[PDB]
Amino acid sequence: ICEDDWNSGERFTCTVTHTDLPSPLKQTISRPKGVALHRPDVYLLPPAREQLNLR
Amino acid sequence: IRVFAIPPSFASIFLTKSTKLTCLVTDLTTYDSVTISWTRQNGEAVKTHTNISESHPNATFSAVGEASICEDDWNSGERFTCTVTHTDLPSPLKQTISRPKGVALHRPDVYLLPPAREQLNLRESATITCLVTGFSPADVFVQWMQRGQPLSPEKYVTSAPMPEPQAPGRYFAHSILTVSEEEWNTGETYTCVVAHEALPNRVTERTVDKSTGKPTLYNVSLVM
Amino acid sequence: IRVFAIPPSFASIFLTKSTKLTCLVTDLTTYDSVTISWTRQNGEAVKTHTNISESHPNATFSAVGEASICEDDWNSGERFTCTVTHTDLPSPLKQTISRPKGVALHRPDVYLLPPAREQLNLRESATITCLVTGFSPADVFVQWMQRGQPLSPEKYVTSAPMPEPQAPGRYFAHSILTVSEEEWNTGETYTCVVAHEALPNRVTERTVDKSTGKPTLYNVSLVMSDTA
Amino acid sequence: DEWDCNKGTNKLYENDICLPPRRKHMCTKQLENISTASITTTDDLLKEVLITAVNEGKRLKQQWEKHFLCDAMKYSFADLADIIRGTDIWKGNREQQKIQERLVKIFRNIYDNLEKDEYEKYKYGTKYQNLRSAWWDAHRKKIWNAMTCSAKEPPVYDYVPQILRWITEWSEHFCELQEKNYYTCKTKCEEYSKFIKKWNSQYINLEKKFKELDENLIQFLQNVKSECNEPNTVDKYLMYTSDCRRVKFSNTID
Ligand SMILES: *[C@@H]1O[C@H](CO)[C@@H](O)[C@H](O)[C@H]1NC(C)=O
Ligand SMILES: *[C@@H]1O[C@H](CO)[C@@H](O)[C@H](O)[C@H]1NC(C)=O
């Protein structure tokens, strides 16, 4: 599916039928809501001095 | 029926210096006539087991045992068997546990990285990494020492050992110590201690402060 | 009478975060029973012209439609149909747009340049230039960010892609921004985000600072003496 | 009661302005010692600003008891407004750099946790000061109410640019202290000679930068030129309550 459908939070349902199952088993899923947002702060670090001495 | 025995590791035998054992049986009857005891390979009975946990309200069973053992006796290879017997299941169960043998041996190489300039520029906190690497037995205990007194466990975390990308048998780990930026500016030494068997001694120690890492700048030369 | 349809470019998609289509009619004043619709090549009506634009008084009809759901289908290059039908015209007029194919996708190579010392000495204003170059398709959107926020489009100016003489398929561009001397002596960071088709991540950032250009050695040999 | 008008670290930019003493020694420790980890919402940020306003109010109340209190408190509210809005001048202070370095975290989190009908309006800017000013103007009424607990209407000097307000504290302070100065004469005479020379060049240095009548500074100057019938005057005629333009300022002793 397109990302616009998924990120909008449109609820989707899964339908599965089988001979073993007397009734179809249905599962639903949607994008979780109520979460908070924060941005990562990358700090790329350089190698230690001692390790380069071993070469 | 499920009977689980957890062998001791460096965390248990080194943090408290007591090679405690445990008999953790789960997913059985909550209330039943339960037998909990450890038995050596030779057959002598172990000492008492106290403070067995109450039945877990989710219909799963819980049990707690402790068996103090000689430190090198566990290293000696004596197989230990936890005894579990119930009236619900008449068949007794004995499970043997022993330490792995034949694994390779390799020395950790502790490197400690000072915080980056940008992180100090944010003026909130500095995170100091401790890059334990190159140790094979895949177990380690990392603790942080400030000025020679123990540091609070809430101020650091530790990853589990993961395989080295370019080494088939070795492992590495991580640990960040969130030190306040003000406390870092007024020079206070922080140091790592690594607990690992393959070291010539038990532990190895490394430390870095602002004095470390500053190179020579002023080649003032006077010529006659 | 004439109808012009233009497809969106990478800049519009990146800035608007959606795909917008135009099926615009020229030299046609306001009449009744004007039908515009964008339909799938397969035949189904993927989207209708909800909230139709009001007719311009000078014989111009906008009639824009949004294919927002099918972001990837436009990139796939599938052909779109616009249905223009009026009472006077017997045969309905059709407009067809699609993504072109066959063009090369050489990657950009941005090089951000610090201001000159002569400009800094006059202490008036520094101008940081962002020499985007090398891209094969002629579509680039450049923004400037300071401490994780896009700067206003008034402060920077982007030049149109100019052909590069050394290689036929490649192009180049540039942009400038007028930083104050105080805010650059303070030593802040400025970033030049480039958006292009050929980039695998479709975005690239670069950073400049007061510390970007400094000399390393200062070997001085003071040879004071008294006798010549 | 010294203004410390020498460059030093009082103001980074090369133009000379004399910092008022009310800016120095403020109880800004509440915002100074903030924890950006524990705070990520607008409601928690308002409470600490209200606390800081209360601390400033009681600090001024204690300082005065060592209308004039109302004026000083008014300009202190304007100063705190400028601190929160992020357009302050005192960048040279090492303490005040950290505050403007850790309010960026709070307002970046706020801008991250916003909704679409405001995200597109506040998307473009610089150092998040547009929505910073929007947040201040949204919560400006409550802050002064918490401040005025010690010892109505919202103040208006907070929109005034800081340099002209600093001129206003200078005028009030100098008229107050010259009233304090006077109310045999050989004993008193020599101090007045030192009283003039300690602030003799204090008037002349700022007058050289009153020309060219910041981005937002010029628009306010142009608008006030259209009104008040005095476009170009070295004296503002706002709350001077005394004679101005060198009439009794210099060499009045003889
Ligand atoms: C410092 O000066 C000495 C003087 O002989 C020289 O030998 C050495 O290479 C210099 N080192 C650096 C890092 O410049
Ligand atoms: C710097 O100057 C010294 C003499 O003052 C000279 O010997 C040295 O070679 C110079 N450095 C380099 C990199 O050439």
Curated annotation (Swiss-Prot), chain B:
Effect in UniProt of substituting residue 143 to A: Has no effect on IgM BCR assembly
Residues bearing glycans: 51, 58
Effect recorded for residue 189 to A: Has little effect on IgM BCR assembly
Region annotation CH4: where it falls in the sequence: 103-212
Ig-like domain mapped to chain residues: 8-98, 108-209
Function: Constant region of immunoglobulin heavy chains. Immunoglobulins, also known as antibodies, are membrane-bound or secreted glycoproteins produced by B lymphocytes. In the recognition phase of humoral immunity, the membrane-bound immunoglobulins serve as receptors which, upon binding of a specific antigen, trigger the clonal expansion and differentiation of B lymphocytes into immunoglobulins-secreting plasma cells. Secreted immunoglobulins mediate the effector phase of humoral immunity, which results in the elimination of bound antigens.
The protein's name in its UniProt record: Immunoglobulin heavy constant mu
Gene: IGHM
Coverage span on the entire protein: 222 to 433 of 474
Curated annotation (Swiss-Prot), chain C:
Result, substituting residue 189 to A: Has little effect on IgM BCR assembly
Domain Ig-like stretches: 8-98, 108-209
Residues covered by region (CH3): 1-102
Disorder association: Agammaglobulinemia 1, autosomal recessive: A primary immunodeficiency characterized by profoundly low or absent serum antibodies and low or absent circulating B cells due to an early block of B-cell development. Affected individuals develop severe infections in the first years of life.
Function per UniProt: Constant region of immunoglobulin heavy chains. Immunoglobulins, also known as antibodies, are membrane-bound or secreted glycoproteins produced by B lymphocytes. In the recognition phase of humoral immunity, the membrane-bound immunoglobulins serve as receptors which, upon binding of a specific antigen, trigger the clonal expansion and differentiation of B lymphocytes into immunoglobulins-secreting plasma cells. Secreted immunoglobulins mediate the effector phase of humoral immunity, which results in the elimination of bound antigens.
Subunit structure: The basic structural unit of both sIgM and mIgM molecules consists of two identical heavy chains and two identical light chains; disulfide-linked. N-terminal variable regions of the heavy and light chains form the antigen binding sites, whereas the C-terminal constant regions of the heavy chains interact with immune receptors to mediate effector functions.
Protein name: Immunoglobulin heavy constant mu
Encoding gene (name): IGHM
Full protein stretch here: 222 to 433 of 474
